[PDB]
Amino acid sequence: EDLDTDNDNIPDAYEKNGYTIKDSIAVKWNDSFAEQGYKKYVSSYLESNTAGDPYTDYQKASGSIDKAIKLEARDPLVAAYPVVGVGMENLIISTSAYINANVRYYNTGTAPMYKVTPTTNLVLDGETLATIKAQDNQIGNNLSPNETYPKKGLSPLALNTMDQFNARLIPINYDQLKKLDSGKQIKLETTQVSGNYGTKNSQGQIITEGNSWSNYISQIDSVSASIILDTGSQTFERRVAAKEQGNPEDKTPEITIGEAIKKAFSATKNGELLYFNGIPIDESCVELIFDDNTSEIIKEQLKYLDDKKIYNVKLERGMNILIKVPSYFTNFDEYNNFPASWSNIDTKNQDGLQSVANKLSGETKIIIPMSKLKPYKRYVFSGYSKDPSTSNSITVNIKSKEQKTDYLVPEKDYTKFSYEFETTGKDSSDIEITLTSSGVIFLDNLSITELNS
Amino acid sequence: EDLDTDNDNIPDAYEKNGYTIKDSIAVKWNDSFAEQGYKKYVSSYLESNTAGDPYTDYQKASGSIDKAIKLEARDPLVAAYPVVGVGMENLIISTSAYINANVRYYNTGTAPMYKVTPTTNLVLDGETLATIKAQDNQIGNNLSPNETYPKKGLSPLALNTMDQFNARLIPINYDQLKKLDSGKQIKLETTQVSGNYGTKNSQGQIITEGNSWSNYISQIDSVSASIILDTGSQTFERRVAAKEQGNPEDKTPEITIGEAIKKAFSATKNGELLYFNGIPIDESCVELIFDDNTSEIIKEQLKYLDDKKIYNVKLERGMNILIKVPSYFTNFDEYNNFPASWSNIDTKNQDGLQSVANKLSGETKIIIPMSKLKPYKRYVFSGYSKDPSTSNSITVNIKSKEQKTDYLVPEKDYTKFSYEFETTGKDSSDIEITLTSSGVIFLDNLSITELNS
Amino acid sequence: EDLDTDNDNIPDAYEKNGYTIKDSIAVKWNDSFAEQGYKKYVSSYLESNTAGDPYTDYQKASGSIDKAIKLEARDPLVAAYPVVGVGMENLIISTSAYINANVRYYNTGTAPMYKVTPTTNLVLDGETLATIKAQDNQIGNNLSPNETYPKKGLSPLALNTMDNARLIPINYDQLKKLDSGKQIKLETTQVSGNYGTKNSQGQIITEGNSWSNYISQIDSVSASIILDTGSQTFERRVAAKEQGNPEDKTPEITIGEAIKKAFSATKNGELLYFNGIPIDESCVELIFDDNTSEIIKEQLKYLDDKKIYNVKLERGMNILIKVPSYFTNFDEYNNFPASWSNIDTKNQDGLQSVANKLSGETKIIIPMSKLKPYKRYVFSGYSKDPSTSNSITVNIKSKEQKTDYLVPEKDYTKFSYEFETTGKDSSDIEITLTSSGVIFLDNLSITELN
Amino acid sequence: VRYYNTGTAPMYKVTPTTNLVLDGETLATIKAQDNQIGNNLSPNETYPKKGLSPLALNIPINYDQLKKLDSGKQIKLETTQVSGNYGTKNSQGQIITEGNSWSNYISQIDSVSASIILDTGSQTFERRVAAKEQGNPEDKTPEITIGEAIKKAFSATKNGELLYFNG
Amino acid sequence: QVSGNYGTKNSQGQIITEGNSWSNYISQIDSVSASIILDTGSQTFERRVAAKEQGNPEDKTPEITIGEAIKKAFSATKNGELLYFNGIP
Ligand SMILES: [Ca+2]
Ligand SMILES: [Ca+2]
Ligand SMILES: [Ca+2]
Ligand SMILES: [Ca+2]
Ligand SMILES: [Ca+2]
Ligand SMILES: [Ca+2]
Ligand SMILES: [Ca+2]
Ligand SMILES: [Ca+2]
Ligand SMILES: [Ca+2]
């Protein structure tokens, strides 16, 4: 039990079953340590970097890395990753003509990125007008996780250089301005970013000169599963390592989607409910969005699993996931943020998902103003329905850009339903949502979720 | 008992219970050493650098660092953060047009910065005209703490260099010159500063070439609390290490805010009074301005502590504290800087904060001239009142741009009150401050301080 | 007794009680070495560089360093500063317009500065035209102490490069203000140089070395002293101790002994000679800053001897020693073109040999030809009057007529007053003083000021 | 344009070189120098990744080429060479991709390997498989059939006796 | 003239072509070797076989007749008494 195959100062017996670092040496995990605040780590005993990130399993578990690295990046399964984007604050074009752009870089990952020099694209309509790289004026010396350069309260930096040594933006001809007056806007997307990372050398300093993140972007992307959490105003992007499909010598631990979300965000769990910052991220309280390939795997994996919940599916390599907390959430237990109260609601019930249900005798109508609704946006109405009778037909009438009239067939147990509608215009007709029940139906966890417009 | 987990020449027994340096070696702390000037140092035994700055706990304690670092930065719990910002002193506008500026770099940290390269933004109103990085002509070789470049007595260095090498700065069009004629000023702010520190090689000479500060900025900020002190004419920024909340593996020492100020400024204490350089900075003798997170943190922590003293609250990572010495402060004991004498003041008392209070029977009125006052600035009225009777109501009549009339209900014991008013115009109406008491009240430590315009 | 805490090849006991270097080894000081010319060196046993300059304590004492480093800097308690300044010789401006400047780098410290690369500022009044650095053409390869580049007799080097781009005012209105009668002042803000260290092969390298690394360290642990002799002005830095630190083992010395150490002055018992010029306390004028004057007055009352040169030196004070241009002592020096009136040298109560026995009034007619117009002057002297019953008033002609009264004390009393002389083709300077009875005068001085 | 990879190993610091051959005569041997360089280019991925606007690279055209292009001719952009880097581990453990080139080994890999190419109609792959020269007896590169070479290059599945590739 | 490099493996193994210029061994190869060129009409091959010095007794370079030089330089095969270069005699 004193063996060390991969040379990472963690015994393979302690690395295979659960371990934690106490006083800079690894010890076997004991279930009584959770009360002292310690965490349980599991990793692969054949690889020095389980996630592919620059720091090994020992450095990530013992915390002997850059102090700006978030505490959820100390898990040997979660990868330390700068996810840096450029957001446009203002656009200035004037007289041939000269265009001046003000940008403010955003970091969302779990690692600081020193000496960032993002490459951005200038595109009007399909055509990339220019691909600009950051000069000496526009290089961000630091970018802490979840912070911006320049920091809040500061004016964004201007981007007006073709090449090094004081070049200037200029459209090639008058055609650009002629179509600009037509009513076209300019987007801004980044193709790549270049930066550094810090490693405490043998002389005790921190060097960020012989280091770059570009060496590990391809490696991190190929051994980890992308997970995103969206909180409406803030965005988070993590990467969790997972084992290869048909690989006998791969030892990356297998974990479920729910456990991985708990690990990648350090969201506390009070028995079963999962809360990040007081905002629930439970399976039924949030709307999950997947790409093409991810949806296929979960559906196949569901029929062989008895619980039939999304959070119990074993994590694999390569899927894409998105998590958007619903904007307006009601559960009739601890949260009701709807500006207008619902109609025909009965809270005296005990058959809900968590505490109670809502028995409806007839129909429920809700009036939602456009005052607190984002104009020119697409929204999706969501909720849970239960009917032991399975003999009542439910129709929905939603007022939007196009009125939606659909029928719903309730199931024996609680079932999640999704309905998508599009609304355009701040000063438009009032949005009407109508649902009717033939008999007595149960309601719980009703939400309206923002989506791409 | 010579165990050394971090290997910084300080055994864990010393580093946890307290230690001091004698003959460049560490010895156990004994209480008899206080009279000789030996200071007590406590730090974390699982890290070579407890504060995160380039120097270890041993080098910071034993003084084997750059001799231009201040004394109070030799504390293992206080980091050597240089806070460098530029000073925009003058404008030159003449022909589009050409712009010339004179700037003077400032340092207010604890450690010097060699080879300073500030980055400057020329913002007019919302838009950012251009981002300027320091040239070889404007790289300041040296910058001592609480000093300038150029040093005092020399004219500021010019700022007319657009980019690398030198090209003349120029507004891009006539539009900004058009609104400049309306009366819009030009502001300058520092987005970042890049500079070196100084260490010695194996041969004994200070090498400052490859070492850069931009590495140790994210680390020190995210491991230490932010403390600022304003003395009216100068400002002093200090960052003090604090432990993480939930870490069980972190052994960073925890100290009160009162001791944190004492360490971060080397403030002498003759029992309970605190002096910076002869100016009292006691909790009762100064008012504090906090941000959102610290405001709710400090209020919650009070109700669990019987003494209810701000200086007695433990320092936790991330808090922002601003200390602004009162510009006009009277205590009726040893200080009264108000130009005009107060009305109805009785010094025959023994129930004051320190020695005596003010036995006011009726009302107090003060006339404040504008000779020693700053126009277009905001001031906050501060003081303490005591009314064991709890049956007299006090109303205040303060003349300002908007006339303020508010009522106050003093408590049984001493209580601080805060009132906000704005002064606009030097050749404006005289400021009238009047307060009336129903019965006999006790007053002590009346303060007036300047706020933002 | 052979313990070495700082690892500079000097035993602990020797560095505290005084040591001297013979045969490239450290030996304990003896009073018998004085007649042979050996010096007594004492330093701190806890630090590699007691002063803070890049050369260690053993290296400075033994002389195993760069040879251009002055004899007055070998002492470990004296820093090795390359105080380098820039002086402008001639101004060329012509067509907006272009400006040419003739400069000449001046060195006044105790060490050379290789690869001098100064940065300058062009100001007319408050506003700064440009911040000029030294390009490839304007770099001095060697700058030995008290030696300038270009050397004596050579024409000053030109300076008209700004980036590249030729130096230019940013607009024509600068010419309009220059034609008004306003000049342009050139000041230096910094300077970049290197210092020589012997590599392991025995060769001297000055590439990776630099002075700007070793400036903040040496300017923080040193007391600044300037000696001004009208023509040649020297600047020196002496290391001191920290007031509030018990671990600081920097030896503490008086101001007087430091001046001996800083300029390697010779002592003829009690008088101090720089280069044959006495620099005794009574023969020189000292101009302190605000900080030092407050501190000096504090220890003045606590000392029985009551001399400025006996005041202990502390970290962080500034001193300026200004040798008077005009001095008299009635013993061995009289530089006045015109003699005084009613002067008697038959006395034995003088400061050193004799005093001035004045019975009445004394008036001096100083010619204008040997005085500097548009300059500020302060007259000095010592007044002794055991009677303490005679009042002395002075009437000196100047730009504003000055009439001041003085009350001499029982012993010798130093008096000084400020006056300004303006105009070359103005009235001749008249100096007159009257004494009620018999007074003692000695060491009358006339000094130029800023 | 949009750089495309069909190999097996990622290329860092991608600086492709192409010429405008204009279906019959070259015009300009364009090179992407500073802002068109792809920091990393993973196998079966393009720079920029899927979902981003095309990379822009920044020449006269005669009236004669206009007619021929309008009559049954098409323009192509052939590549002469591409200079990149690759990842190498260390004793310190960092992946160092500066200095290491994908031009030193290209004429070594190319001269000893037998090219095999497969196209599925939507995405194209190129694999190199090592083989042995007949003359040299000291040569010890194993000799295997094409069927073994197909399965070892595109990672097919040998179910029974037929090859299955991605179903 | 032309400038370029060659490639020699190093201690770790990765081929280095940075400092290894060809132009260092050009004035040496032309001074110790005999120039032999063969043309087939379509493409031409150039080879430079080594040859000993005339009067240097310390020169141990082997002596081979022109017949062996052509066989060695182009890897020709000898069938019977005829040198065959890929079918073409
Ligand atoms: Ca292991
Ligand atoms: Ca491992
Ligand atoms: Ca429920
Ligand atoms: Ca320790
Ligand atoms: Ca430590
Ligand atoms: Ca009191
Ligand atoms: Ca020493
Ligand atoms: Ca010593
Ligand atoms: Ca005398």
Short-list A332, A323, A453, A438, CA closest to A383? A332
Token pair for B357: 């209070």
Nearest to B118 by CA among B95, B88, B96, B154: B88
Can you tell me whether residue E27 is helix, strand or coil?
A: helix
In single-letter form, the type of residue at position C93 comes to I
Residue among C358, C379, C317, C364 nearest C441 (CA):
C358
CA-closest candidate to residue A242, choices A259, A266, A217, A265 = A259
Q: In this complex, do B67 and C130 lie within 8 Å of one another by their Cβ atoms?
A: no
Q: Which of residues 15 through 74 in chain A touch D, CB cutoff 8 A?
A: 48-49, 54, 56
Distance between CA atoms of B401 and A55, rounded to whole angstroms? 60
- The candidate with the shortest Cα–Cα distance to D30, out of D72, D77, D68, D70, is D77
Q: Is the peptide bond before B150 cis (omega within 30 degrees of 0)?
A: yes
User: Which residue from A minimizes the CA distance to D88?
Assistant: A215
Structure tokens at C196: 């020589």
What is the number of other CB atoms lying within 10 angstroms of the CB of residue B66?
23
Beta-carbon contacts below 8 Å between A and D: 68
Helix (H, G, I), strand (E, B) or coil at A22: strand
Whether residue D101 lies within 8 A of chain E, CB to CB, comes out as yes
3-state secondary structure of A191: strand
Say if CB C166 and CB C160 are below 8 A apart.
yes
d(CA B399, CA B421): 8
CA B196 – CA B207 distance, rounded (Å): 10
Smallest CA–CA distance, residue B233 to chain A, in Å, is: 23
CA nearest neighbour of A157 among A213, A89, A62, A68? A89
- Calculate ∠ Cα D32-D37-D42, nearest 5°: 130
Distance CA A142, CA A196 (A): 10
**Has C4 been labeled as part of a binding site?**
yes
Among C residues 116-175, those touching chain B with beta carbons less than 8 Å apart = 119, 121, 123, 126-133, 162-165, 170-171, 173
State how far the Cα of C250 lies from the Cα of B387, in Å rounded to an integer.
57
Ligand 5 centre to CA of C180 (Å) is: 65
- Which residues have beta carbons under 5 A from ligand 5 (an ion)? B 6, 8, 57
Do the two chains E and D touch, given a threshold of 8 Å on CB pairs and at least 3 pairs?
yes
**D105 contacts E15? CB cut-off 8 A:** yes
List of chain D residues whose C-beta atoms are within 8 Å of the C-beta of residue E15: 104-105, 108
**What sign does the dihedral D97-D102-D103-D104 (CA atoms) show?**
positive
Yes or no, beta carbons of E7 and D100 under 8 Å apart: no
Our CA-based measurement puts residue A141 at a distance from the nearest CA of chain B, in whole angstroms, of 6
Q: Token pair for residue B147? A: 């000093």
Q: From the CA of A15, which ligand is nearest?
A: 1
A161 in D contact zone (CB under 8 Å): no
* CB-nearest partner of A215 from D12, D38, D58: D12
Mutate to test the interface with A, among B131, B186, B293 (most CBs of A within 10 A): B131
Q: Are there at least 3 beta-carbon pairs closer than 8 Å between E and B? A: no
Residue A55 · residue A75 · CB < 8 Å: no
- CA end-to-end distance (rounded Å), chain A: 57
Cβ-based contacts under 8 A for chains B and C? 114
Residue A421, H or E segment: strand A415-423
Q: Is C9 on the interface with B (CB under 8 A)?
A: no
β-strands D3-4, C402-406 pairing? unpaired
Taking Cα atoms as reference points, which of B232, B214, B225 lies closest to residue B252? B225
Largest Cα separation within chain D, whole Å, is 61
**B172–A67 CB contact, under 8 Å:** no
Phi, psi of E42 (to 5 degrees): -90, -60
CB contact under 8 A, C217 and B142: no
Q: Where are the beta strands (DSSP E) in A250-343?
A: 268-270, 273-275, 287-290, 321-324, 328-330
CB of B24 within 8 Å of any CB in chain C?
A: yes
SS3 per-residue string spanning chain C: CCCCCCCCCCCHHHHHHCEEEECCEEEECCHHHCCCCCCCECCCCCCCCCCCCCCCHHHHHHCCCCCCCCCCCCCCCECCCCCEEEEEEEEEEECCCEEEEEEEEEECCCCCCEEEEEEEEEECCCCEEEEEECCHHHCECCCCCCCCECCCCCCCEEECECCCCECCCCCCHHHHHHHCCCCCEEEEEEEEEECCEECCCCCEECCCCCCHHHCHHHHHCEEEEEEECCCCEEEEEEECCCCCCCCCCCCCCEHHHHHHHHHCCEEECCEEECCCCECCCCCCEECCCHHHHHHHHHHHHCCCCCCHHHCECCCCCEEEEECCCEEECCCCCECCCCCCCCCCCCCCCCCCCCCEEEEEEEEEECCCCCCCCCEEEEEEEEEECCCCCCCEEEEECCCCCEEEEECCCCCCEEEEEEEEECCCCCCCCEEEEEEEEEEEEEEEEEEECC
Where on the phi/psi map is residue B295: left (φ > 0), alpha (ψ -120 to 50), or beta?
alpha
Residues of D in contact with E18 (CB under 8 A): 99
Residue C173 φ then ψ, to 5°: -65, -20
Q: Cis link prior to B156 (omega < 30° from 0)? A: no
CA nearest to C171, candidates B97, B104, D86, A226: B97
**D19 interfaces chain E, CB cutoff of 8 Å:** no
Closest CA to D142 of D132, D154, D157: D132
Residues of A in Cβ contact (< 8 Å) with D32: none
* Tokens representing residue C169 in the block: 């005012």
User: Smallest Cβ distance to B36: which of C164, C190, C246?
Assistant: C246
- On whether any CB of chain D is under 8 Å from the CB of E7, the answer is yes
- Please report residues of C whose CB lies closer than 8 A to that of B160: 130, 170
DSSP state of A299: H
Q: Is B292 annotated as a binding residue?
A: no
Distance CA C175, CA C93 (A): 10
Ligand minimally distant from the alpha carbon of residue A253: 2
Q: Which residues of C touch B98 (CB under 8 A)?
A: 170-171
What is the 3 state secondary structure string of chain B?
A: CCCCCCCCCCCHHHHHHCEEEECCEEEECCHHHHHHCCCCECCCCCCCCCCCCCCCHHHHHHCCCCCCCCHHHHCCCECCCCCEECCEEEEEEECCCEEEEEECEEECCCCCCEEEEEEEEEECCCCEEEEEECCCCCCECCCCCCCEECCCCCCCEEECECCCCCCECCCCCCHHHHHHCCCCCCEEEEEEEEEECCEECCCCCEECCCCCCCHHHHHHHCCEEEEEEECCCCEEEEEEECCCCCCCCCCCCCCEHHHHHHHHHCCEEECCEEECCCCECCHHHCEEEECHHHHHHHHHHHCCCCCCCHHHCECCCCCEEEEECCCEEECCCCCECCCCCCCCCCCCCCCCCCCCCEEEEEEEEEEECCCCCCCCEEEEEEEEEECCCCCCCEEEEECCCCCEEEEECCCCCCEEEEEEEEECCCCCCCEEEEEEEEEEEEEEEEEEEECCC
Closest CA to B227 of B273, B192, B276, B194: B276
Please, which experimental method was used?
A: cryo-EM
With an 8 Å Cβ cutoff, is B209 touching chain C?
Answer: yes
Task: Report helix, strand or coil for D3.
Answer: strand
Nearest CA in chain A to D46: A191
The answer to the question of whether B42 is labelled as a binding residue is no
What are the distances in angstroms from CA C279 to CA C276, C334, C377?
Answer: 9, 16, 19
Residue A209 marked in a binding site: no
CB of B49 within 8 A of CB of B180? no
Q: For residue E26, what is the enclosing H or E element? A: helix E26-29
Q: DSSP letter for D31, please.
A: B
Query: Which residues in chain B are closer than 8 Å to A205, comparing Cβ atoms?
Result: 54, 199, 211, 215
Which tokens in the block code for residue A189?
Answer: 């997307």
DSSP code of residue D67: H
Q: Establish whether C442 is an annotated binding residue.
A: yes
**Residue from B155, B82, B91, B85 nearest B129 by CA:** B91
Q: Characterise B281 by phi-psi region: left (phi > 0), alpha (psi -120 to 50), beta (else).
A: alpha
Residues from chain B that touch A199, judged by Cβ atoms under 8 A, are none
Are C11 and C2 contacting, i.e. CB atoms less than 8 angstroms apart?
Answer: yes
User: Which residue has 């277009």 as its token pair?
Assistant: B376
Torsion of CA C309, C312, C318, C320, to 10 degrees: 10
| CA D103 centroid distance within chain | 13
Q: Can you tell me the distance from the alpha carbon of D81 to that of D102, in angstroms, rounded to the nearest whole number? A: 10
* Residues in chain D after which the backbone breaks (C–N beyond 2.5 Å): 58
In our burial notation (b when 16+ CB lie closer than 10 A, e otherwise), range B198-223 reads bbeeeeebbbbeebbbbbbbbbbbbb
Which value in Å is the resolution of this experimental model? 3.7
Q: Is the peptide bond before D48 cis (omega within 30 degrees of 0)?
A: yes
The Cα A115–Cα B213 span in angstroms is: 12
Q: List subunits contacting chain A, requiring 3 or more Cβ pairs under 8 Å.
A: B, D
Q: Do D12 and A218 touch (CB under 8 A)?
A: yes
Question: Which chain D residues are closer than 8 Å to E16 by Cβ?
Answer: 104
CA–CA gap between residue B370 and residue E63 (Å, rounded)? 111
The C-alpha atoms of residue B206 and residue B203 are separated, in whole angstroms, by 9
- Whether residue C139 contacts residue C103, with contact meaning beta carbons closer than 8 Å, is answered with no
Number of cross-chain residue pairs from A and B with Cβ atoms under 8 Å apart: 115
B210 touches chain A (CB under 8 A): yes
Taken in order C168, C170, C175, C181, is the CA torsion positive or negative? negative
